[PDB]
Design a protein around this nucleic acid. Structure first.
Length: 49
DNA sequence: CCCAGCTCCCTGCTGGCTCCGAGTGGGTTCTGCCGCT
């Protein structure tokens, strides 16, 4: 049944228990932005990483 | 008035040099030291 309206879904749905894994890759360890931060000594371009 | 060097040019081979996808996240170790001057 659709949760929003309570109506049945016309097609029947394949459902059951499946072993799932949480991988170490999490968005909060990847998100990054920069607006004029530190720069390299030799060339004066933004730092890496 | 032919021939053997001699020169000059073209081929073919071998050796030498440069290049080898785009981003991104972590980790670790290493950046000298010893004999005797």
């Amino acid at each position: 049944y659709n949760g929003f309206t309570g109506r049945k879904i016309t097609s029947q749905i394949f459902i059951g228990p499946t072993y799932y894994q949480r991988l170490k890759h999490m968005v909060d360890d990847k998100i990054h932005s920069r607006a004029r931060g530190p720069i390299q000594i030799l060339n004066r371009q933004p730092m890496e990483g």
